[PDB]
Assembly symmetry: D2
Homo-oligomer: 268 residues x 4
């Protein structure tokens, strides 16, 4: 086919070629889809990275803490894909949390401004991002954001866990909004993946103990995952997303798909 | 081209032109997949029904309560798709619970021996069928079974619920077995679909009030469903089965996918 | 004798004679527990309200958005229950979300800065309150907070839902912290209770159709509830909080207990 | 009090003084409650064990695979507690599975008769047990059975996992039945406990590998459990049950309480 053939999808979240958003972006192109991209803080420095990709993309500035960039989103996206033209997808592949809310830093010593910043970026934005892009989105289309399963507590994810719990809650509201448009809204709970927002994360060897709470993460997840799990390889999470963007899951919304190797279904 | 070009796939459970398996076989085929089919005791019935599929495909007896068929089955399947050629997909769309287990019939009056039969056919069969079909499956291959969200109580479903709770659990284990061969196990939790048997209960064959309980229950999927649910269109669900059978969710096994238009994620 | 003979217990959140905390303080007391109480900015209001409790008990200002109260609080609590005497129980019955976050107000139009306030007060406060009160707690002691089942979408609750999703997650971590001191953390997921603010929304202060949405939603707890649910009787819920504060669930922490008459376990 | 004061509760499942049912039985007596007991296969040999207990008990034969013993249950129980006298509780502390369905024995090599036997005993019976005893049970009373969390697959629990998934499904039906009587019905998902149906289980050193998948179980669960977990000590699971029998959780049914040290809420 080109499983995303002719489809016109925006893809947020890139900042290196180890970014998952990069990998969704790649696969979506391998597969048919004229793209539009967003980046946060040097674009300059990103365009170099989005170049590294098969086909090419209008790449627009977007800082999701900016009321001013969101108000315009819809504007700019129509410039760049043409007029009388709407989007068929959207990828929220964005997140962030102060070092304070994460790693060995005690849980109680994060002050709320720090956490607020996390939630806003990792949580709220899925909803701004849908408020801005649904008006220019077609029937039978799709939004996807990237989750990491927060049902259970764990060490190191600390307050990011709490943001991800809020993400899932948001996601199902946004589905209720999106469905007035014929749009689906779903997350992809992914298994762990080698991106430098991880070697931030616990990170940075804030440890030497942290060659460890990363090796043992990769062993952990591979052991539990009935089909095994490769932390060096985003393409299984990226193919799973293109699936949601696809029409082949036309009756799932409000929902969370786990591309984690079925590790979450096993206790050990 | 799209989804299944090349893939050989068993598909259980055809009994009517309206059976969920049938709409699975159809879509499988229109997506370039060559099949073997199974069916249970009304066999030349099944051949008339399966003649209305796009491609012909062979068809084999298979009552999952009988070991001489289970034993014999990889034998017969190999035989109808050619020696040293193996199966990339398998679909159990099978299920049964004596009427004693269901509707208006009091919950406490189902004899264990009716309940043991429904659990045999609806839940244990998924394993016994995996046991037998895994020797002729192929890496990156896919088994998918049919589910109804058993995770909470409801009118009518009664002890089919309890079987579906058993299946969700069998499936995790089956994944734990199937990963040995590079094979995913997964269920698809569908919304209600107006099969024949359901056109009959809506039409009053269980009584002029039994049919109302089922109707308010039934009817509130669409009301809950962010993108609606139409129970007289099985296509979204068959489309969902193909997604699992495809290479496009390779990091999910052990799990359940909700093809219920989103409703299981909303309260009202 | 029964439940709490001997136990010293803080209990947040009294604002009305109908507040869920109040019916908690009452039952705590009738069960032989000596208390300290907190409240927020309508302070001599709180003293008239708390005069109708069986025993007197002291009362302290505590707005959880302010650090000089949080800092100061174990100071003040120690002071009102006597030096080298510590707390066996703690109750957060606190919660707020601007009206922009709720009812008929469109989901996408709540400004992050309203959402960050509701999450501050409803969810982050549970940690910041544990941080401060754990130094003066005692082994086998108990913290319990108030929840509403946020695990799926619904009309009205909107972004309070998203906060409650955050709380369920904070609570797991707080347990992970509190176990350091032989202290359980747990939430109680209540059914709806006709507090004052809710007698007002049922009575139409959000509009002659906003009040209907809430009524069909509200009303179907009792219909779902295997043992009924009466929202103008907060006693079962206060009774439930005491169970947690008691020695009689010592192997449960991190968790949520559903005091909703069973309804969250049934579909219809 | 005697938190179960004056209360009249039947307690099934004893066969040694390491049985959990033994421990619930003890604590319920420590606490006020005239008991009635059931045992399975030498009673003879059990009465010696139920003697070991504080106060004393009518101890009745009950093999839950016997249509004949259930038909009589209600009869015998009224002989033994007097007439114009009903029960206020019931403890399903019973289970069983063929060696075949458990341990290193492959999952696929259990034949269905074996599993049927498991489900019947571990699953169905909660429901026969409520069908027989609700007719002689009072308003505001309670039934409890013992769960071990089956949401995730794991090794060794094999088909017992599947029975426990069916138990939870059953439990919420039985609650729907029980509530016509004012009766609650709930499970207690317990953490692991040293009982000789465990050193059956994997068991019997069917291993030497099995000093191990038991030490590592005890280490596992203690590590994850924010308040720590002692596998040599049933009393925390037993106090949790008496709690359900109590009136202090008067608004929970259909439900599952976890007395596992909050290990299930943590991933690690
Ligand atoms: N790394 C993993 O194993 C993993 C696993 C599961 C889920 N996730 C989630 O998947 C998503 C992708 O993360 P990733 O690991 O590819 O890391 P990444 O660092 O490559 O991506 C993070 C992105 O968020 C962007 N970002 C930060 N603030 C922004 C803002 N204010 N506005 C717009 N974009 C902003 C950054 O520019 C960056 O592109 C995130 O939600 C992450 O939490 C990651
Ligand atoms: N119909 C729905 O709305 C719905 C919703 C969710 C899940 N499901 C599930 O989908 C599956 C199919 O049901 P359907 O809707 O296609 O109804 P159906 O009646 O068309 O399918 C049932 C199949 O089970 C077969 N069967 C019973 N005993 C058998 C045996 N011993 N050996 C082989 N086959 C046997 C029937 O012959 C038929 O082929 C079942 O799992 C059902 O529980 C159906
Ligand atoms: N009412 C229900 O039907 C219901 C159901 C489930 C959960 N809950 C939860 O129970 C809790 C109590 O609500 P309620 O029903 O008792 O309503 P309420 O209005 O009586 O209680 C809210 C409390 O939060 C306080 N508050 C707000 N901001 C504060 C601050 N900065 N510092 C200290 N206190 C502050 C209020 O003053 C009051 O004391 C909340 O968690 C609520 O979300 C209520
Ligand atoms: N041992 C544990 O760590 C653990 C943990 C969680 C849950 N559980 C569950 O708690 C419950 C108590 O088990 P336990 O470990 O105390 O083991 P146990 O062997 O002491 O109790 C098992 C009981 O089931 C009874 N039983 C077997 N067949 C019976 C029948 N046909 N009719 C009536 N009774 C019958 C036996 O006589 C025995 O009393 C069971 O459901 C078990 O699965 C046990
Ligand atoms: O959520 C994640 C989960 C995993 Cl296992 C790995 C990376 C993840 O993503 C992040 C974690 C922390 C920050 Cl500050 C930013 C991002 Cl994107
Ligand atoms: O699981 C199901 C759920 C729904 Cl809502 C509708 C039909 C279903 O499927 C069955 C129900 C009862 C029997 Cl006897 C056989 C089957 Cl296939
Ligand atoms: O009718 C139903 C409707 C729903 Cl939504 C769920 C279960 C139902 O019950 C049945 C489904 C199939 C068969 Cl054959 C018999 C019965 Cl009673
Ligand atoms: O969480 C709740 C759930 C329900 Cl059904 C009813 C009341 C609740 O509590 C609140 C809702 C909104 C605000 Cl602003 C403050 C509080 Cl305390
Ligand atoms: O009204 C409600 C009823 C339910 Cl069952 C759940 C949430 C509701 O919404 C509210 C609860 C409290 C406040 Cl102050 C405002 C609103 Cl809109
Ligand atoms: O369910 C259990 C879980 C654990 Cl960790 C320990 C014991 C358990 O209980 C049983 C396990 C197997 C058999 Cl054959 C009988 C029983 Cl009572």
């Amino acid at each position: 086919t080109g499983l995303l053939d002719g489809k016109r999808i925006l893809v947020s979240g890139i900042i290196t070629d180890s970014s998952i958003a990069f990998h969704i972006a790649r696969v979506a192109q391998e597969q048919g889809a004229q793209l539009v991209l967003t980046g946060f803080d040097r674009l300059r420095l990103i365009q170099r990275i989005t170049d590294r990709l098969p086909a090419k993309a209008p790449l627009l500035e977007l800082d999701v803490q900016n009321e001013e960039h969101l108000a315009s989103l819809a504007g700019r996206v129509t410039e760049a894909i043409g007029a009388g033209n709407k989007l068929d997808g959207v990828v929220h592949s964005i997140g962030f949390m102060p070092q304070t809310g994460m790693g060995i830093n005690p849980f109680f010593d994060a002050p709320y401004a720090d956490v607020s910043k996390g939630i806003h970026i990792s949580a709220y934005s899925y909803a701004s991002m849908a408020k801005a892009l649904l008006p220019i989105m077609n029937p039978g289309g799709s939004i996807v954001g990237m989750d990491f399963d927060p049902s259970r507590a764990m060490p190191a994810y600390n307050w990011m866990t709490v943001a991800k719990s809020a993400l899932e809650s948001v996601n199902r509201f946004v589905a209720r909004e999106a469905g007035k448009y014929g749009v689906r809204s779903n997350l992809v709970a992914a298994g762990p993946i080698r991106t430098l927002a991880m070697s931030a994360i616990v990170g940075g060897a804030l440890g030497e103990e942290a060659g460890a709470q990363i090796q043992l993460l990769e062993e952990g997840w591979d052991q539990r995952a009935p089909i095994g799990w490769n932390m060096k390889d985003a393409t299984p999470v990226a193919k799973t997303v293109c699936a949601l963007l696809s029409d082949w899951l036309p009756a799932t919304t409000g929902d969370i798909i786990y591309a984690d190797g079925g590790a979450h279904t096993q206790l050990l």
